[PDB]
Structures are given as C-alpha cells and as structure tokens.
Ligand binder design. Structure first.
Ligand SMILES: Nc1nc2c(ncn2[C@@H]2O[C@H](COP(=O)(O)OP(=O)(O)O)[C@@H](O)[C@H]2O)c(=O)[nH]1
Ligand SMILES: [Mg+2]
Length: 261
C-alpha cells in the first residue's frame, strides 16, 4: 500500500505543478512553488474508494540550464540506487514484506519540452539511462502550448525517436504477458507520451469545482479528457497499473540491481 513516483525533466516544465495536481486530484475523497533547487519528497495518504494508499512523489531539480550538462543525471540516478540499496539491507535483516518500508521509485514521469520538433540529444541520453534501472513514463509537458493537431503530430515523432534510440518505455513491449495485456497496453503505448497539463488551482466552471488553468480565453480543465491527457497519466499510475509498476520494479529492476551486490 506504498507507491513511490518521481518527476524528472528540465526546469520550467510544470513538474512541481504536476506533483501538486496529483495530490489535489478530485478523484480522491480525502484531504490535502519556486524553482526547486534540490531533491525533496512529499508523502500523503490518499483514499480512492475506501482503499488506503501512501503515495510519495519525489520532485527533482532541473538540468540542461548550464553550458556543460555532462553527468547532470547523477543526483537522480544516485537517488534511485540509494533506494535499491536501502531496500536490500532491509530485506536481509527484517525478512517479512509487511515490515520493510519500500522507498524504491516505482515509476519515473519524464517531462519532454513541447517544442513540436523531436527528442533532444540531452533528453535521449537521460532517457536511455533511466530506463536501464527504473520504469519511465514520458509526457509532453505543458501541452496546452500546442494545439490538438500539434500534440498528436509531436506524439508520433517522439514515439519514432524512442524506437530509433531503442528507449524501451513503460509499458515495455517485452513484458506483455497474457492474451489481452497487449490489447490494453497497445492502447496505452499509442497514447504515450501523454500530452498533460498541470494545475494547482480550483475554479468554478458551470457549477462545477474543477482543477484548471485560468487564462484570458477560458479555463483549461486538467481532469477533463477533452482538454488534456492528465487523466490517462493519473489513472495509469494510481488506478490501473500501480501493481504492474511495483511488480516490475521489484522483480526486474531491483533484481538487476543486486547483480552488482
Ligand atoms: N501553460 C502551462 N503552464 C504551466 C503548466 N504547469 C505549470 N505551468 C507554469 O509553468 C511555470 C513553471 O512551472 P513549475 O511547476 O515550477 O515547473 P518546474 O520548473 O518543472 O518545477 C509556472 O509559471 C507554472 O504556472 C501547464 O500545464 N501549462
Ligand atoms: Mg520545480
């Protein structure tokens, strides 16, 4: 009943806004932003439909702002490995699952800038290293800066770039198991990367209290599937694939880590 995710990407892409959007989603029936400068984690226990879930989201500093960005992935990778390390020591000492705190990163949400072009070399290098040790779901950040047509065309280009550079992204096609896993996973692969919009403000729209971005032309409703694809990301992580992500972390990624220990 513990689920951990991490937001990764260049600064100025709405990452910290998206962390708040996740905890503030109207889907939960429970209770409860400068340029982030170091890694810090926020933990809140949310209740979906009577089910209890301790959700931790780790927010990260950006990269790519400097002239030389070499090794800018080291803090993030260091965090992911230190959670694998801590878990191995705990499994050795206290043997039972019920008593081991799981701080392992079960999914990384990687924020791609909405350039409309294609994946930058910097993002390719970062993605190729993250997928080597963690689940990665990429998203088109701040996607309201593109039109509907432009999001779709940009999604396809990125999907092509991922294939060219062999970046196997979640849901990885090799781990498709049962007959109809693919029938539901291909529908998700076709949508990934999700074109997401983040909001930490509530607005009253036609008698409805919704999360949204208030602009001069209207309110962009981030939980409205006609406005953006945030509900797909929110449901993939928390509702439909939470267990599948945790299974892959523990059985593949974590087991691959102890091959060096
Ligand atoms: N247009 C648009 N702006 C956003 C979105 N999410 C956040 N912002 C704005 O982007 C700026 C930086 O957002 P922030 O959450 O700090 O991103 P971070 O630097 O990655 O942590 C702020 O002015 C936000 O209000 C979005 O989905 N669309
Ligand atoms: Mg931030």
């Amino acid at each position: 009943f513990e689920f951990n995710i991490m937001v990764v990407g260049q600064s100025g892409l709405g990452k910290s806004t998206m962390v708040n959007t996740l905890f503030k989603s109207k889907v939960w029936k429970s209770n409860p932003t400068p340029q982030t400068l170091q890694l810090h984690s926020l933990t809140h226990v949310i209740e979906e439909k009577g089910v209890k879930l301790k959700l931790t989201v780790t927010d990260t500093p950006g990269f790519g702002d400097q002239i030389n960005n070499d090794n800018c992935w080291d803090p993030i990778l260091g965090y992911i490995n230190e959670q694998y390390e801590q878990y191995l020591q705990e499994e050795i000492l206290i043997t039972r699952q019920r008593h081991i705190p799981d701080t392992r990163v079960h999914c990384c949400v990687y924020f791609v800038p909405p350039t409309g072009h294609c994946l930058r070399p910097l993002d390719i290098e970062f993605l190729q290293r993250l997928c080597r040790t963690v689940n990665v779901v990429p998203v088109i950040a701040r996607a309201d800066s593109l039109t509907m047509e432009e999001r779709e065309a940009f999604r396809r280009r990125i999907q092509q770039n991922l294939r060219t550079h062999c970046i196997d992204v979640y849901p990885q096609m090799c781990f498709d198991e049962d007959i109809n896993d693919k029938i539901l996973n291909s529908k998700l692969r076709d949508r990934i990367p999700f074109a997401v919009v983040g909001a930490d403000q509530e607005h009253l729209v036609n008698g409805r209290c919704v999360l949204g971005r208030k602009t001069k032309w209207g309110i962009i409703e981030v939980e409205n599937m006609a406005h953006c694809e945030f509900p797909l990301l929110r449901d993939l992580l928390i509702r439909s694939h939470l267990q599948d992500l945790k299974d892959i972390t523990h059985n593949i990624h974590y087991e691959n880590y102890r091959v060096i220990r």
